[PDB]
Structure formats: structure tokens, C-alpha cells
Amino acid sequence: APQQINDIVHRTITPLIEQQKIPGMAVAVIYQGKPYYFTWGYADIAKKQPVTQQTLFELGSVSKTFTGVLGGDAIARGEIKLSDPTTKYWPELTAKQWNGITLLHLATYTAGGLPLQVPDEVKSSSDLLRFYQNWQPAWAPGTQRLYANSSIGLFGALAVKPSGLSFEQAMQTRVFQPLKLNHTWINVPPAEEKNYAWGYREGKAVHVSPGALDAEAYGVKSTIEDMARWVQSNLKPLDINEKTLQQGIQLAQSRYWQTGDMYQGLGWEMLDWPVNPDSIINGSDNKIALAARPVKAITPPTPAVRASWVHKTGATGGFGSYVAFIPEKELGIVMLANKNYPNPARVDAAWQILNALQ
Amino acid sequence: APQQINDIVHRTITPLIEQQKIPGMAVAVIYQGKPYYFTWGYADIAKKQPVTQQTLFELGSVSKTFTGVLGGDAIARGEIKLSDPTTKYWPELTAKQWNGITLLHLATYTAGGLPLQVPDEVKSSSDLLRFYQNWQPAWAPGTQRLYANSSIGLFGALAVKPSGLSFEQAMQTRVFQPLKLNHTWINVPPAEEKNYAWGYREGKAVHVSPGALDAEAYGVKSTIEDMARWVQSNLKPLDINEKTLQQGIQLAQSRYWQTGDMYQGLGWEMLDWPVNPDSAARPVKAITPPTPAVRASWVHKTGATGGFGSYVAFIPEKELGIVMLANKNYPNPARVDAAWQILNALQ
């Protein structure tokens, strides 16, 4: 790699691993559109299996960016509209509180207080209907953003209905394959299991457990090479050959809501570039990231702005991930670790790197 | 031309010309993405000059589609946002009625009752300022559509301000040139004058007269070949090399408002295809958020000047479209009926 990149990465990430006690880490820096890779430590501590470019990490909520792009792809195909009522795609969801709640609201956490998590007792589709039928809004739709798996997870599930495909088959077929993400999985198949890293929580080896709407909200596992291609594709969607996917990516980076200096896309979140680092860093702390915030409607949505910092944090019990890129600079980073360490440490490190390189 | 295209076009347009007494006409059918041209009658009755593939016609309000695309291109460039207040790009617009009137409302005729025409007495930029300051809205923004040159025209003027180019300069360099529309003009140059058809109103040869915001609302003159290429560009924006222009086209075909069967885009108006050939202040329903360009639509615009009548319709899903240009302003329903006869037969 260029020495500038080797220098800043080693000075920033290597001490981060020390400080946070991360067992294993992979990083990709996209620079002038080209990926550069860095690896540390172990995917499996007991078996002393090192992190490689073939190591699968759990993405956690970085999966929401795949869901937002799949959803945008179904819009470009004319299969769904974000202006459509939720109940048009789930006819059994008839309770009156759902009435003005659209696909847009579900995709952007603005339905009016759907909870962060689907309760773990909710297992069957029957359980799920009852949950949603019984849910009472804390706010009117399109007034507050409350980051929620039960919001975007439902969006994902309903977005694929017109196509008749299961969520996983739509995702493999319409997103993973055209982009040649050949090692990215919702369900890791047998042949890939020796590459699937352990996550570590309080020194125990953990994998993410099943849960309602997991695939849709936090269920993607991927490699650093595939993640770098993910960033490449989102950096320049016009280079993508599949027309609906190309439009899908730009739809997921449109700005539908503003809260402070932050804009909500579909999965992706954006700020104008140049950004105030304190904002992104402190903003990624769960005290702020998980709190209700008032939103201003952007009427109509601003299309993908090139001068943007586009980003997303992800975590499962054993993993912590981060993706950020600036389309105007052809610059990005991906950070995959098999320990869930604080979000502000991730963003701070990513900012130090991308700021040094822009 | 395939005999099928040849037969439907001539069976339809011949009676049209005779019934409406149209002096000259040009038509382009776009079929499976390829253009076929047809010409009839006179560009200039007194000089016995025929309509050719190089004759320039006034487009009238079909110019609004160019204005909507150029505004869409300015959005894609990050120069403007449709969500921005009008007063952001015209600070001197301090009158309080302008509060929540955005560029969206201007583009889509939903500002609250801006008039069809800018008064003929408005003949300077401070004249124009006073006009908009003194304008009293009948309705809240985003609630009724009233088709208006003073509405879309203003949008076109504001959309180009960040660039610093005049409206004509920006249209040329950002829309005409990239699409190779080398015989499309806001102002017809002396080199092209011999191709500029006369319009005919009650038997008198007329050209469009000067007026405030003419360029932005009704000022484009074009040939059937450039108009065909305009349709090809709108049928498949993704084939366009210029990134912001490609996005600008798609933004212009997005659905922002609904009234009855019709959706309002930027300049373009759309209905779901297939469409009954058969589908004014009108209340609008906001489409929140706007639906991105729908392939399965009938996308269209009528245009008129004192002496010209034009129509463009296309269906992206079918790779199908038509342009009809005439140097007589004749009833819109006659245009649409002929266009539908032609396109229904070919789909």
C-alpha cells in the first residue's frame, strides 16, 4: 500500500486493538477507489486461527445498509413505493394505529416509536403479527426518529413481498451476486464455517443467536474483501451494470429526514462533508444513537449528495463493525472486529484515517 | 420505415391535418428505440417552403420538460434542493407569503395560485420582483395545482443562479450539448432562420413574441430529429454518459403529486400505463416521498404558442414514443387521440 496509508492505519488501528483488547481485526481502506487490506490477531483464539481476507465477521446493524439497498432496488423495479401504507403489503395488519404508517416510516425509524428490539418471546409469524397489532405509538408518524430493528426489519420483510422471493433469496440474487460478493451470507453455509470467526464477549466465544427479523436487521456475515467491494459500489453506484441496483444504491443514500446535522437514508446515515468529528464521534455513543430525536421531513428527499460522510455502525454480542465513505473523495474505510467495543472508539479511528487521507 | 409504422402514421395524421387545417407537420415515432420521420405540408406558405427534418418549430410548453430536466440536473449537481425555500435563491423576496414556498412548489405549480401568465407589463427584473412580492396566494403551498408559467418559469430562473450562467447558457451546456441537440435553440440564430417555420393563427404568419420568463416556460424551438433524440434520452436516461443529466432526467419523471389519474413531475406529466386514452384549479395529493421514474407509464406534455401546437408522449417500458410538431395551435384532444392511435397500434 502507499506508505501514507500504512503509516496512518498502523498508528491508529494497532493501538486501538491494544486499548480495547480486540482479539482479531480486519480493515480495508479504499483510496482513490482502490482497496488496501490490514489484518491483526485471531478469528479463533483457542485454535490460533488468524484473521485473513477470507474471515467472515458478523456485521450486526451494518446489515441495515444491505436492507436499505435491497429496498431501494425493489422501488427502482416498481415493485414497492415508500409512500405505500404498511398494510398494503401485510393485509392482516389492520389495527387503526397503522393507518398513516408507510414503508418510508418503517425504513427510516419514523413510524412513531417502534421498539429497538423485537421481544425475544416473539418467535413465529403469528407472534409477530400480534406484536405489531398490539403496538401503541409513542408519537405520530413522521415526527420522531427512534432507531429500531422492529422498524427496518419489518421494512425489509415487506419490501420483498411483491417479488415473492424470501428475504435471503432476494438479497443473494439482487444484491450480493451482481456485486460479486461471493463470501457474504445471511446464513453461513457448511463450506464457509471454517472461515466464520468467533465473536468474543467477556472472553467467551459467541455467535449471534436467532431472533425474529434477524436477517433483515442484523443478520449479514461478510469478509473484509466483500465489504471493501460493498464500499466501492456505494462510492460509485453509476459504475454498477444492473440498472435497478444502481438506482437502489442512490435511493438508499437519499436524505429523507434531518435530525441536527445528521440525515437518515435507507440503512445508511449521512452528514455533509466536511463534517464536525465531535458530532459523528459523540453522536455514535448509544446514549444519543439509541434515543428519540425530532426529525424534519426533507420534502422531497435530497438525492445522494456526493459531498457526504456516509456511514453505519454495527454490533452483535461478539462483534463490532464500522463502515464510512466520502463519495466526493473516492475514499472509505471498513473496520471489522470480533469484539463489540464502544462506537466512539470506531468512529474516532475511522476519522483519523480518512481525515489524514482526504 | 416498417410498413406497419408507415401505415398507422399516415392513416392517423393525414385526416388530422385536413380536419384541423394544419399548414405543416412533422412526426417522429420512436419504435424499439429507433426513430422514424414523417413530414407534411408547409413551413412557410407564402415562400412555398416544405416542412423537412431540419424545420424548427416552436415547442411552447414542451419547453417545460427541458426546464424540469435542467433543474433536475442542478439538483443532481448539488447546486439546489427542491426542499429549499424560494427565498434562499432570491433573498430580495421578503414578502411573508413566501415563507414555506419551496422550489418544489414552483416546479410543480403548487405554490398556492401563481397565475398562468406573467403580466405583459412585467418587462424588467425589478418589474418581476414587484410582481412576486405583491402576489397574494389563494391557497396554502402544496394543496392545489394551477398550471402556470409564472410558477415553473421562476423555478427555471432560480435553479440556474448557483451556476452563475444565464438560463440559456446553462440549458445549452448542460442539456442541449451533452445530448447532441445541435438544432435546438432558446434564441434561433441567424444561421438557422431559413429553417424556422412560420406559425399560423387565423391565417396570419406569427412567431412567439418576447415576454418575461419566456425562455424558462415556453421558449425552445427544435427540429423533429432533435425532438426524437430528446425522447430517446428520456426513454432511457441510464444510457446517458453525463451523470448529473442522467439523474436529472429521472428526477423530472418522478411523481411528486397526484390529481385524478395524472402525476406531476418536473415539466413532464405521467399516468400509469396501460392508460385509458380518455383520462382548472385541482386539489393535489402529495406523494410522500416522490415515486422514482416509473417505467410503466405514459409520460407526456402538450405545448402551444399563438401559431404552433406540439405533443410528446412516450412509454419507457415499451421503448416507444412519439413527437408531433405543427405550425398551427389546434385542440389538445386531437393531438392526444392521434398519438394514442399511433402508439396503441405499435405496442
Ligand SMILES: *[B]([O])([O])C1=[C]C2=C([C]=[C]C([C]N([C]=O)[C]=O)=[C]2)S1
Ligand atoms: B445494531 O445497531 O448492530 C443492532 C443489532 C441488534 C440490536 C438490538 C438487538 C439485537 C438482537 N438481540 C435481541 O433482540 C440480541 O440480544 C441486535 S441493535
Ligand SMILES: *[B]([O])([O])C1=[C]C2=C([C]=[C]C([C]N([C]=O)[C]=O)=[C]2)S1
Ligand atoms: B404552454 O402550455 O404551451 C403555454 C405557453 C404560454 C401559455 C400562456 C401564455 C403564454 C404567453 N405569456 C406569458 O406567460 C403571455 O401571457 C405562453 S401556456
